[PDB]
Design a protein around this ligand. Structure first.
Ligand SMILES: COc1cc(-c2ccccc2C(=O)Nc2cnn(C)c2)ccn1
Lengths: 39, 156
């Protein structure tokens, strides 16, 4: 029996940590809403 | 109960202790999360009962107490931030340039940041603070890191 708890405001932070890469990926989306990698 | 615009954890007591199953956004009296987090179930907000209003398993989204309200888009150029809310850890902004999910229906934003599954439903923002979509539905690549979409709903 699920419940919610507030965790913060939705705000852009100046000088947040900047990270992660930017990959271009071929994918398919099935009727169950699962993404899969094509090739 | 609490209806303040902002970001929230989704918890269950049905397992060992209190377990965070995901994250969502409260905006204009409506709660937004991913379908896999709640599976369409009712939520509590203290003494309050939030009922599902709209949901679609294929989009992997669900809204509570009204129609989907978020209609901002990754503009394809500008950076973004994952306002990650990880299980038992403080909300933290992470800035990233999203990559791209090319599909037969079109192209979607993608972010290659590996957080625990209970981070599902954390919002992705643009530089004006607008929610451009939610984190947690994509693919695991060779590298072992999950790549999530930028999953965003249609406002009616
Ligand atoms: C083997 O795959 C994973 C994925 C995850 C994961 C990590 C971050 C955000 C979200 C998920 C996640 O579970 N997504 C998701 C979408 N739909 N379903 C049913 C589940 C963590 C561990 N293993």
């Amino acid at each position: 029996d699920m419940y919610i708890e507030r965790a913060g405001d939705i705000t852009w932070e100046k000088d947040a940590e900047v990270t992660g890469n930017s990959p271009r990926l071929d994918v398919a989306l099935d009727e169950s809403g699962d993404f899969s990698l094509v090739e | 109960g609490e209806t303040t615009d902002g970001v929230y954890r989704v918890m269950t007591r049905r397992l060992l202790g209190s377990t965070q199953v995901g994250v969502g956004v409260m905006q204009e009296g409506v709660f937004h999360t991913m379908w896999h987090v709640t599976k369409g179930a009712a939520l509590r907000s203290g003494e309050g009962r939030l009922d599902p209003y709209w949901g679609d398993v294929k989009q992997d989204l669900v809204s509570y107490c009204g129609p989907w309200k978020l209609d901002a888009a990754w503009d394809g150029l500008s950076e973004v931030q994952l306002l990650a809310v990880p299980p038992g850890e403080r909300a933290k902004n992470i800035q990233t340039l999203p990559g791209i999910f090319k599909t037969k229906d079109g192209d979607i934003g993608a972010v290659a940041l590996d957080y625990p599954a209970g981070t599902s439903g954390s919002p992705i923002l643009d530089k004006c603070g607008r929610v451009i979509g939610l984190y947690g539905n994509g693919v695991v690549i060779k590298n072992g890191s999950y790549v999530s979409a930028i999953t965003q709903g249609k406002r009616e």
